[PDB]
Amino acid sequence: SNMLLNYVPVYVMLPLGVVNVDNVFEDPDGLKEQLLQLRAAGVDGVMVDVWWGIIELKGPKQYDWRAYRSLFQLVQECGLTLQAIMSFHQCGGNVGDIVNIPIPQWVLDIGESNHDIFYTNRSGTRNKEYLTVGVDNEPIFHGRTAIEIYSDYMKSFRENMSDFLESGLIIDIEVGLGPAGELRYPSYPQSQGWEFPRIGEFQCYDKYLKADFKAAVARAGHPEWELPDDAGKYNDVPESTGFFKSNGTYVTEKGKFFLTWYSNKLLNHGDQILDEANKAFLGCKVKLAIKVSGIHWWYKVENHAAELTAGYYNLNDRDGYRPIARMLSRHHAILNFTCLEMRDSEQPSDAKSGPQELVQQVLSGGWREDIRVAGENALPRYDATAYNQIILNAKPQGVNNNGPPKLSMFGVTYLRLSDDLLQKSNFNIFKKFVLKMHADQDYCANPQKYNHAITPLKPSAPKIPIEVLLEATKPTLPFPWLPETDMKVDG
């Protein structure tokens, strides 16, 4: 039928701090002209972080939704839909920090007395950006567990914003699952010295994770087994560590057991909280989503080190992403990926980066598991090259002049809405990127037309036992990518 079946929507992410630490919607008039600039270009919607640390600031269950309400009004007045991120993580925190938004101080307060609530590397450094999965179910936060906190927060949101939900402003709810809202471990902390082509460190050292592990190796028949002590430091390179070296420890029955344990905590972390989300939004016309990190560096050495330390147990012969997709499928959730723009020929050669193949692996795995796949660009780009990369990934096999494409992404959330973007020559290319994403059609306000109607969220399907999830580790061949998009921005 209609070319319109080829339309891939486009979202633009709002500026960090649009609502400040103080819970103040700063510059309504300013955002306003911007938002209007966007709607004219043909942007389908926008994406905003909903800081847990601004909202539940004063105390447990002391939520103040006002400044966000004002923000949602204005968006809705601008003819834009909106993706909301349940951000339970810290914003910024390091040097020359744009905005800094820590987590609720009252939580921080508990951590001065119980440090084991933060991710901890082997040296004992406490990462404060996010609560360790080790406390998901520890009723230590004035009677509540962490999952309860997150659950309550999503429930409060649902109720205090029913109007916008009822009215279809909010298209999807992205559930924040770790640092940067990503389902992963804080393995490469800039704040800790991490520099790029660096492998990163495992983050399983808090008392809770350590005790978990030791009980588990004891059940497995090896009480004597300890956490990795040969993995190195953030900035290492893998052949330089006993864990990751060839025939290293990461290939030992003790290392494999470790990695499975460590990666499985994320899966279970995501699964339970997504459970709570499904509860909170049952009935609403929204889709649930999670962000999965694009760790492309070391993708091209057998050991896939940076991925491993992050909790993505992905090897050349063990698919460590498809299990996530599979987990998501019971909640009818979307896998929101990134690094959609990156090309292989753009990386330091000594970083062994495999962004393109990484992307093919992640997307294929989702389509394979029959879920919906979305993504973002990881870094700020303004050139046709980035744009054409993003366009290829979106419709890996090109346009179907005869129907819907056999393969297409569910949406792409461009990164950052700055003055730079809005600059003339820049914006001009953007408009084109927007046109091509839309497959050359005009912006389309009814999503049903291009087969994206949203239905009221249903209850999750039943638990998938880990043994069944783990089956998805079986490697598969990606689907076929065109070498280049048939719909280039660049004439």
Side-chain angles (χ1 to χ4, degrees):
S1 180
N2 218 338
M3 266 279 257
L4 189 64
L5 261 347
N6 292 274
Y7 189 119
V8 164
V10 173
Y11 309 89
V12 172
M13 159 110 254
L14 295 190
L16 264 9
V18 67
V19 359
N20 83 22
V21 211
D22 293 302
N23 214 349
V24 157
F25 178 19
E26 297 224 332
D27 187 47
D29 327 76
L31 191 61
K32 169 172 213 194
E33 329 168 341
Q34 299 190 282
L35 265 14
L36 289 171
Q37 281 277 79
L38 263 17
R39 155 92 279 95
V43 181
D44 303 273
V46 298
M47 185 183 285
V48 67
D49 276 277
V50 188
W51 307 96
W52 166 33
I54 285 177
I55 280 141
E56 199 173 5
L57 168 64
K58 256 203 202 347
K61 314 211 243 184
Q62 305 267 90
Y63 319 96
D64 172 13
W65 304 98
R66 318 109 111 200
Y68 276 92
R69 292 191 50 82
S70 311
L71 194 215
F72 299 167
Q73 255 270 89
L74 166 69
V75 181
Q76 172 185 256
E77 295 170 3
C78 301
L80 292 162
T81 53
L82 156 310
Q83 312 170 111
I85 301 155
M86 297 302 100
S87 312
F88 300 108
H89 62 275
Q90 149 202 301
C91 190
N94 21 86
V95 71
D97 261 343
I98 11 185
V99 10
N100 223 265
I101 308 161
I103 68 193
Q105 182 74 48
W106 62 260
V107 178
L108 251 35
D109 291 335
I110 286 157
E112 317 235 43
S113 67
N114 180 171
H115 287 117
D116 290 295
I117 71 180
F118 296 111
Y119 284 130
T120 295
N121 70 339
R122 123 184 292 252
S123 325
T125 297
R126 275 34 247 248
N127 190 155
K128 288 204 197 308
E129 246 184 318
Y130 189 82
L131 264 24
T132 172
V133 39
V135 284
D136 284 4
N137 306 110
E138 278 308 315
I140 58 198
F141 305 92
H142 291 297
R144 286 190 300 170
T145 71
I147 298 184
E148 287 169 345
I149 299 187
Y150 306 144
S151 181
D152 280 348
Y153 179 104
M154 282 176 306
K155 264 149 172 333
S156 175
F157 183 84
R158 186 243 173 99
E159 298 155 1
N160 297 275
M161 306 289 191
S162 359
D163 57 335
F164 294 113
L165 289 154
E166 255 160 52
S167 77
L169 172 65
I170 300 164
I171 252 13
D172 67 67
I173 308 270
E174 200 110 352
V175 16
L177 260 343
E182 265 156 356
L183 183 59
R184 59 161 184 89
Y185 282 100
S187 63
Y188 43 114
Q190 209 109 254
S191 44
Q192 277 188 75
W194 188 90
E195 278 176 73
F196 170 53
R198 266 358 151 232
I199 68 161
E201 307 178 22
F202 290 119
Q203 303 288 147
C204 35
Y205 295 89
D206 62 78
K207 56 144 159 318
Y208 302 101
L209 285 183
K210 200 190 310 174
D212 194 52
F213 180 57
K214 311 221 23 93
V217 298
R219 280 186 311 284
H222 299 271
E224 76 281 353
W225 279 358
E226 270 301 341
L227 302 169
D229 66 347
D230 36 343
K233 286 167 122 116
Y234 295 115
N235 289 113
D236 288 335
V237 99
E239 51 289 346
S240 151
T241 71
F243 190 95
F244 295 112
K245 74 152 58 175
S246 159
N247 294 321
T249 301
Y250 88 90
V251 132
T252 264
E253 89 175 335
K254 151 192 214 231
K256 292 203 263 153
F257 185 98
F258 174 64
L259 293 173
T260 298
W261 170 86
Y262 184 84
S263 60
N264 274 190
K265 295 266 148 208
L266 298 180
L267 290 188
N268 266 291
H269 177 75
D271 198 24
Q272 278 193 68
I273 282 164
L274 245 10
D275 260 327
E276 288 306 316
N278 216 282
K279 275 184 213 138
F281 295 100
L282 219 201
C284 307
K285 273 133 108 52
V286 301
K287 248 136 211 208
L288 254 30
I290 75 159
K291 285 120 165 293
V292 159
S293 195
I295 296 162
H296 51 113
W297 61 106
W298 311 107
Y299 183 80
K300 291 238 267 216
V301 284
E302 276 187 302
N303 48 269
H304 297 246
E307 283 154 292
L308 299 207
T309 56
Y312 308 133
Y313 196 181
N314 191 56
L315 290 194
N316 297 334
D317 63 326
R318 194 195 185 263
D319 191 323
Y321 301 98
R322 184 149 76 101
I324 313 193
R326 176 102 119 209
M327 182 270 288
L328 287 180
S329 99
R330 69 180 287 261
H331 302 281
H332 321 96
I334 290 175
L335 205 183
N336 182 190
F337 199 46
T338 346
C339 29
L340 280 197
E341 86 270 24
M342 311 225 143
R343 308 253 24 201
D344 281 1
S345 47
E346 264 153 28
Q347 322 290 331
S349 252
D350 53 299
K352 294 265 143 42
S353 263
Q356 313 173 227
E357 30 292 304
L358 174 57
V359 169
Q360 310 172 188
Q361 197 206 328
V362 177
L363 310 196
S364 297
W367 291 321
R368 181 95 193 196
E369 288 306 293
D370 191 24
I371 68 160
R372 292 164 213 137
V373 174
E376 322 172 334
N377 52 286
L379 301 143
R381 291 266 233 116
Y382 306 113
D383 68 275
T385 98
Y387 292 139
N388 314 297
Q389 191 44 206
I390 288 170
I391 296 147
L392 176 72
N393 282 336
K395 276 185 295 276
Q397 267 155 256
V399 154
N400 182 8
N401 291 42
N402 281 54
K406 158 173 79 64
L407 262 12
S408 73
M409 285 177 79
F410 193 71
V412 166
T413 307
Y414 181 94
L415 183 136
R416 260 2 168 216
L417 167 247
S418 43
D419 285 314
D420 289 57
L421 172 58
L422 259 347
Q423 157 249 98
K424 174 262 253 285
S425 309
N426 281 353
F427 208 59
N428 223 73
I429 328 138
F430 190 79
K431 281 156 53 181
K432 283 242 243 359
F433 152 65
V434 174
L435 176 74
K436 303 280 165 180
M437 284 299 280
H438 287 171
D440 279 348
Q441 307 311 260
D442 297 319
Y443 157 76
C444 180
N446 191 1
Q448 183 161 313
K449 291 188 191 213
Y450 62 80
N451 212 175
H452 258 49
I454 310 187
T455 330
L457 219 214
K458 13 221 27 52
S460 276
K463 259 287 261 88
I464 309 159
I466 191 155
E467 85 266 8
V468 180
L469 257 354
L470 267 16
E471 305 185 346
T473 69
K474 186 169 99 176
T476 41
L477 314 178
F479 292 96
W481 258 230
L482 244 16
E484 247 193 312
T485 66
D486 59 344
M487 282 245 193
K488 271 155 63 156
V489 143
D490 230 3

Tab-separated table of all heavy atoms in Angstrom, residues 153-194:
chain	number	residue	atom	x	y	z
A	153	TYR	N	6.835	5.575	42.902
A	153	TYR	CA	7.114	6.809	42.109
A	153	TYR	C	6.413	6.776	40.764
A	153	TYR	O	5.868	7.784	40.280
A	153	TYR	CB	8.644	6.965	41.950
A	153	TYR	CG	9.100	8.142	41.149
A	153	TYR	CD1	9.630	9.248	41.792
A	153	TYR	CD2	9.268	8.019	39.782
A	153	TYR	CE1	10.104	10.319	41.038
A	153	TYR	CE2	9.728	9.068	39.007
A	153	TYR	CZ	10.157	10.213	39.649
A	153	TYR	OH	10.687	11.227	38.901
A	154	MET	N	6.401	5.561	40.171
A	154	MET	CA	5.710	5.403	38.926
A	154	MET	C	4.177	5.514	39.095
A	154	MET	O	3.501	6.141	38.291
A	154	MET	CB	6.156	4.133	38.234
A	154	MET	CG	7.480	4.349	37.572
A	154	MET	SD	8.171	2.886	36.810
A	154	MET	CE	8.240	1.587	38.046
A	155	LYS	N	3.640	4.928	40.169
A	155	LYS	CA	2.243	5.028	40.549
A	155	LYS	C	1.822	6.502	40.769
A	155	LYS	O	0.816	6.941	40.192
A	155	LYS	CB	1.986	4.204	41.817
A	155	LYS	CG	1.440	2.797	41.580
A	155	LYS	CD	1.872	1.769	42.657
A	155	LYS	CE	1.188	0.368	42.566
A	155	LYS	NZ	-0.177	0.376	41.921
A	156	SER	N	2.585	7.267	41.615
A	156	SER	CA	2.326	8.683	41.850
A	156	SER	C	2.281	9.472	40.531
A	156	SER	O	1.387	10.271	40.312
A	156	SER	CB	3.233	9.347	42.906
A	156	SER	OG	2.991	10.757	42.992
A	157	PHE	N	3.219	9.165	39.627
A	157	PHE	CA	3.298	9.775	38.353
A	157	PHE	C	2.058	9.480	37.561
A	157	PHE	O	1.443	10.344	36.977
A	157	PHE	CB	4.486	9.203	37.609
A	157	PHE	CG	4.711	9.831	36.242
A	157	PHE	CD1	5.422	11.034	36.118
A	157	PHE	CD2	4.207	9.246	35.077
A	157	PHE	CE1	5.587	11.670	34.887
A	157	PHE	CE2	4.361	9.864	33.834
A	157	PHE	CZ	5.092	11.057	33.739
A	158	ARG	N	1.713	8.238	37.471
A	158	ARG	CA	0.533	7.851	36.747
A	158	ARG	C	-0.721	8.590	37.187
A	158	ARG	O	-1.531	9.013	36.373
A	158	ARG	CB	0.327	6.355	36.831
A	158	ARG	CG	-0.810	5.861	35.961
A	158	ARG	CD	-1.920	5.235	36.755
A	158	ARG	NE	-3.047	4.914	35.921
A	158	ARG	CZ	-3.323	3.671	35.411
A	158	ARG	NH1	-2.519	2.593	35.590
A	158	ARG	NH2	-4.476	3.503	34.693
A	159	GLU	N	-0.924	8.687	38.468
A	159	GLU	CA	-2.091	9.300	38.997
A	159	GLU	C	-2.066	10.812	38.815
A	159	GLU	O	-3.017	11.388	38.329
A	159	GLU	CB	-2.308	8.905	40.486
A	159	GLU	CG	-2.528	7.421	40.751
A	159	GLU	CD	-2.125	7.026	42.171
A	159	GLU	OE1	-1.686	7.844	43.002
A	159	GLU	OE2	-2.278	5.704	42.432
A	160	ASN	N	-0.981	11.466	39.248
A	160	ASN	CA	-0.878	12.907	39.129
A	160	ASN	C	-0.778	13.468	37.719
A	160	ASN	O	-0.920	14.646	37.561
A	160	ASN	CB	0.196	13.511	39.994
A	160	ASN	CG	-0.077	13.289	41.455
A	160	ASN	OD1	-0.811	14.082	42.058
A	160	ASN	ND2	0.536	12.248	42.063
A	161	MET	N	-0.650	12.628	36.692
A	161	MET	CA	-0.550	13.039	35.279
A	161	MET	C	-1.612	12.351	34.418
A	161	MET	O	-1.425	12.220	33.195
A	161	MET	CB	0.847	12.679	34.641
A	161	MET	CG	2.035	13.207	35.425
A	161	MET	SD	2.257	15.017	35.347
A	161	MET	CE	3.905	15.254	36.073
A	162	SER	N	-2.671	11.768	35.043
A	162	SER	CA	-3.673	11.062	34.233
A	162	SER	C	-4.224	11.894	33.161
A	162	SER	O	-4.553	11.389	32.123
A	162	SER	CB	-4.835	10.521	34.975
A	162	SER	OG	-4.605	10.836	36.293
A	163	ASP	N	-4.397	13.149	33.422
A	163	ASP	CA	-4.854	13.989	32.341
A	163	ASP	C	-3.974	13.909	31.061
A	163	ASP	O	-4.451	13.767	29.959
A	163	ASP	CB	-5.234	15.437	32.771
A	163	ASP	CG	-4.156	16.227	33.451
A	163	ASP	OD1	-3.231	15.736	34.064
A	163	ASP	OD2	-4.387	17.520	33.434
A	164	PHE	N	-2.700	14.055	31.188
A	164	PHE	CA	-1.886	14.032	30.002
A	164	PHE	C	-1.892	12.647	29.353
A	164	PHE	O	-1.692	12.497	28.142
A	164	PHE	CB	-0.446	14.441	30.367
A	164	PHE	CG	-0.404	15.863	30.807
A	164	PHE	CD1	-0.094	16.201	32.123
A	164	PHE	CD2	-0.786	16.855	29.921
A	164	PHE	CE1	0.038	17.526	32.509
A	164	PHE	CE2	-0.798	18.193	30.326
A	164	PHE	CZ	-0.358	18.524	31.615
A	165	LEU	N	-2.033	11.619	30.199
A	165	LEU	CA	-2.070	10.237	29.705
A	165	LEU	C	-3.357	10.021	28.933
A	165	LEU	O	-3.352	9.577	27.785
A	165	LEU	CB	-1.895	9.188	30.850
A	165	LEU	CG	-0.479	9.190	31.378
A	165	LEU	CD1	-0.378	8.708	32.804
A	165	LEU	CD2	0.451	8.417	30.435
A	166	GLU	N	-4.470	10.374	29.580
A	166	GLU	CA	-5.751	10.280	28.958
A	166	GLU	C	-5.759	10.970	27.644
A	166	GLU	O	-6.319	10.440	26.748
A	166	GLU	CB	-6.829	10.904	29.783
A	166	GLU	CG	-7.700	9.855	30.453
A	166	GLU	CD	-8.442	10.440	31.636
A	166	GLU	OE1	-9.100	11.554	31.312
A	166	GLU	OE2	-8.387	9.959	32.780
A	167	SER	N	-5.175	12.166	27.571
A	167	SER	CA	-5.118	12.981	26.368
A	167	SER	C	-4.099	12.592	25.286
A	167	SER	O	-4.057	13.269	24.242
A	167	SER	CB	-5.032	14.467	26.665
A	167	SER	OG	-3.728	14.801	27.055
A	168	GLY	N	-3.296	11.514	25.512
A	168	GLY	CA	-2.326	10.989	24.520
A	168	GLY	C	-1.066	11.864	24.305
A	168	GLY	O	-0.411	11.840	23.241
A	169	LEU	N	-0.701	12.668	25.300
A	169	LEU	CA	0.464	13.449	25.100
A	169	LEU	C	1.678	12.516	25.171
A	169	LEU	O	2.563	12.505	24.304
A	169	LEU	CB	0.519	14.471	26.212
A	169	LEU	CG	1.821	15.223	26.193
A	169	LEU	CD1	1.910	16.041	24.918
A	169	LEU	CD2	1.926	16.130	27.366
A	170	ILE	N	1.650	11.649	26.209
A	170	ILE	CA	2.724	10.716	26.588
A	170	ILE	C	2.708	9.382	25.821
A	170	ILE	O	1.858	8.554	25.987
A	170	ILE	CB	2.664	10.489	28.083
A	170	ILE	CG1	2.860	11.806	28.788
A	170	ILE	CG2	3.771	9.566	28.447
A	170	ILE	CD1	2.450	11.771	30.240
A	171	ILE	N	3.642	9.190	24.951
A	171	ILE	CA	3.684	8.066	24.083
A	171	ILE	C	4.373	6.825	24.750
A	171	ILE	O	4.089	5.662	24.451
A	171	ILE	CB	4.413	8.548	22.782
A	171	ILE	CG1	3.442	8.675	21.648
A	171	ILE	CG2	5.550	7.651	22.374
A	171	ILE	CD1	2.022	8.611	22.212
A	172	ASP	N	5.406	7.064	25.519
A	172	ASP	CA	6.086	5.990	26.087
A	172	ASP	C	6.757	6.389	27.288
A	172	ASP	O	6.951	7.574	27.497
A	172	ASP	CB	6.901	5.050	25.155
A	172	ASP	CG	8.134	5.623	24.469
A	172	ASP	OD1	9.111	5.913	25.319
A	172	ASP	OD2	8.247	5.657	23.217
A	173	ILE	N	6.894	5.411	28.144
A	173	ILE	CA	7.520	5.587	29.443
A	173	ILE	C	8.815	4.791	29.524
A	173	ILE	O	8.829	3.569	29.466
A	173	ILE	CB	6.607	5.174	30.582
A	173	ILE	CG1	5.242	5.876	30.465
A	173	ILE	CG2	7.323	5.477	31.880
A	173	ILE	CD1	5.169	7.229	31.187
A	174	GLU	N	9.898	5.481	29.554
A	174	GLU	CA	11.139	4.825	29.491
A	174	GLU	C	11.548	4.509	30.915
A	174	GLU	O	11.638	5.389	31.722
A	174	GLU	CB	12.043	5.838	28.748
A	174	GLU	CG	13.330	5.249	28.104
A	174	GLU	CD	13.306	5.218	26.549
A	174	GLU	OE1	12.114	5.546	25.960
A	174	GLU	OE2	14.319	4.906	25.908
A	175	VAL	N	11.717	3.267	31.305
A	175	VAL	CA	12.095	3.061	32.679
A	175	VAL	C	13.574	2.951	32.957
A	175	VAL	O	14.259	1.999	32.528
A	175	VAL	CB	11.141	2.269	33.564
A	175	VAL	CG1	10.120	1.484	32.801
A	175	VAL	CG2	11.751	1.462	34.661
A	176	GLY	N	14.077	3.955	33.700
A	176	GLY	CA	15.474	4.072	34.101
A	176	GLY	C	15.872	2.901	34.985
A	176	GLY	O	15.231	2.616	36.029
A	177	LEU	N	16.975	2.242	34.594
A	177	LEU	CA	17.370	0.947	35.207
A	177	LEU	C	18.797	0.870	35.835
A	177	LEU	O	19.150	-0.138	36.467
A	177	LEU	CB	17.190	-0.144	34.133
A	177	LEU	CG	15.924	-0.998	34.185
A	177	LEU	CD1	15.211	-0.926	35.515
A	177	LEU	CD2	15.013	-0.740	33.007
A	178	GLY	N	19.606	1.932	35.647
A	178	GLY	CA	20.935	2.057	36.185
A	178	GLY	C	21.492	3.428	35.854
A	178	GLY	O	20.759	4.323	35.444
A	179	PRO	N	22.827	3.604	35.992
A	179	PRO	CA	23.521	4.841	35.590
A	179	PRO	C	23.127	5.295	34.196
A	179	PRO	O	23.029	4.493	33.257
A	179	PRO	CB	25.000	4.447	35.513
A	179	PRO	CG	25.099	2.949	35.702
A	179	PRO	CD	23.718	2.420	35.986
A	180	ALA	N	22.917	6.602	34.031
A	180	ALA	CA	22.446	7.149	32.770
A	180	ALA	C	21.082	6.601	32.317
A	180	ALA	O	20.802	6.730	31.094
A	180	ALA	CB	23.398	6.880	31.627
A	181	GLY	N	20.293	5.990	33.261
A	181	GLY	CA	19.009	5.347	33.001
A	181	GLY	C	19.070	4.010	32.221
A	181	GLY	O	18.038	3.460	31.748
A	182	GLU	N	20.308	3.507	32.086
A	182	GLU	CA	20.655	2.339	31.286
A	182	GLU	C	20.760	1.088	32.101
A	182	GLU	O	21.268	1.068	33.207
A	182	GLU	CB	22.020	2.611	30.691
A	182	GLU	CG	21.945	3.195	29.291
A	182	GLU	CD	23.164	3.984	28.889
A	182	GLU	OE1	24.050	4.110	29.841
A	182	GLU	OE2	23.305	4.461	27.800
A	183	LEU	N	20.228	0.027	31.565
A	183	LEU	CA	20.344	-1.248	32.234
A	183	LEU	C	21.779	-1.792	32.106
A	183	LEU	O	22.090	-2.576	31.192
A	183	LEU	CB	19.396	-2.227	31.597
A	183	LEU	CG	19.406	-3.597	32.292
A	183	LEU	CD1	19.034	-3.468	33.763
A	183	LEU	CD2	18.418	-4.576	31.615
A	184	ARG	N	22.673	-1.328	32.997
A	184	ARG	CA	24.041	-1.763	32.998
A	184	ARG	C	24.707	-1.358	34.315
A	184	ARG	O	24.062	-0.786	35.212
A	184	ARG	CB	24.744	-1.185	31.823
A	184	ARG	CG	24.684	0.330	31.852
A	184	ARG	CD	25.737	0.938	30.981
A	184	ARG	NE	25.817	2.378	31.027
A	184	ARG	CZ	26.558	3.117	31.865
A	184	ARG	NH1	27.208	2.617	32.918
A	184	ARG	NH2	26.580	4.438	31.664
A	185	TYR	N	25.953	-1.751	34.500
A	185	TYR	CA	26.645	-1.481	35.744
A	185	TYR	C	27.401	-0.205	35.512
A	185	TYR	O	27.671	0.128	34.361
A	185	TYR	CB	27.616	-2.650	36.107
A	185	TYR	CG	26.943	-3.871	36.688
A	185	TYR	CD1	26.676	-4.998	35.908
A	185	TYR	CD2	26.688	-3.966	38.052
A	185	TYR	CE1	26.028	-6.120	36.436
A	185	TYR	CE2	26.111	-5.103	38.610
A	185	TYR	CZ	25.709	-6.152	37.790
A	185	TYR	OH	25.172	-7.281	38.353
A	186	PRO	N	27.770	0.497	36.544
A	186	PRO	CA	28.534	1.740	36.353
A	186	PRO	C	30.033	1.395	36.017
A	186	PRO	O	30.970	1.618	36.804
A	186	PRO	CB	28.467	2.422	37.745
A	186	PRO	CG	27.864	1.449	38.739
A	186	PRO	CD	27.306	0.290	37.930
A	187	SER	N	30.288	0.770	34.887
A	187	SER	CA	31.612	0.267	34.668
A	187	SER	C	32.687	1.226	34.131
A	187	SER	O	33.896	0.971	34.232
A	187	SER	CB	31.592	-1.056	33.959
A	187	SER	OG	31.021	-0.881	32.689
A	188	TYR	N	32.270	2.313	33.547
A	188	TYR	CA	33.217	3.226	33.027
A	188	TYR	C	32.914	4.603	33.515
A	188	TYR	O	32.329	5.393	32.752
A	188	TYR	CB	33.209	3.208	31.510
A	188	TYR	CG	31.826	3.167	30.861
A	188	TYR	CD1	31.397	4.261	30.102
A	188	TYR	CD2	31.030	2.018	30.861
A	188	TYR	CE1	30.165	4.303	29.477
A	188	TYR	CE2	29.790	2.024	30.234
A	188	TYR	CZ	29.363	3.175	29.557
A	188	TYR	OH	28.186	3.179	28.882
A	189	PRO	N	33.285	4.881	34.793
A	189	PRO	CA	32.960	6.128	35.421
A	189	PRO	C	34.001	7.137	35.180
A	189	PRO	O	35.096	7.023	35.702
A	189	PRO	CB	32.916	5.902	36.921
A	189	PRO	CG	33.469	4.536	37.144
A	189	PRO	CD	33.764	3.926	35.788
A	190	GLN	N	33.624	8.103	34.345
A	190	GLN	CA	34.425	9.290	34.043
A	190	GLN	C	34.921	9.902	35.328
A	190	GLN	O	36.010	10.457	35.410
A	190	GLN	CB	33.530	10.321	33.358
A	190	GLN	CG	34.265	11.245	32.413
A	190	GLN	CD	33.921	10.937	30.957
A	190	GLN	OE1	34.764	10.339	30.196
A	190	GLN	NE2	32.715	11.401	30.542
A	191	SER	N	34.048	9.830	36.328
A	191	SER	CA	34.274	10.439	37.631
A	191	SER	C	35.313	9.695	38.398
A	191	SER	O	35.625	10.051	39.532
A	191	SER	CB	33.008	10.495	38.460
A	191	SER	OG	32.334	9.248	38.337
A	192	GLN	N	35.751	8.586	37.839
A	192	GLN	CA	36.709	7.756	38.525
A	192	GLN	C	37.986	7.653	37.723
A	192	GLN	O	38.899	6.940	38.074
A	192	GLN	CB	36.112	6.373	38.930
A	192	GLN	CG	35.340	6.473	40.240
A	192	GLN	CD	34.901	5.143	40.796
A	192	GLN	OE1	35.713	4.419	41.323
A	192	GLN	NE2	33.603	4.835	40.752
A	193	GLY	N	38.070	8.449	36.692
A	193	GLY	CA	39.236	8.394	35.905
A	193	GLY	C	39.023	7.695	34.554
A	193	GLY	O	39.778	7.922	33.604
A	194	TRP	N	38.016	6.859	34.431
A	194	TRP	CA	37.792	6.205	33.156
A	194	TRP	C	38.045	7.158	31.994
A	194	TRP	O	37.492	8.268	31.949
A	194	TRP	CB	36.487	5.439	33.138
A	194	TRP	CG	36.319	4.592	31.879
A	194	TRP	CD1	36.713	3.324	31.699
A	194	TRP	CD2	35.733	5.043	30.673
A	194	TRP	NE1	36.398	2.975	30.347
A	194	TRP	CE2	35.831	4.002	29.761
A	194	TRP	CE3	35.133	6.243	30.279
A	194	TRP	CZ2	35.380	4.096	28.440
A	194	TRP	CZ3	34.662	6.324	28.953
A	194	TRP	CH2	34.782	5.301	28.076
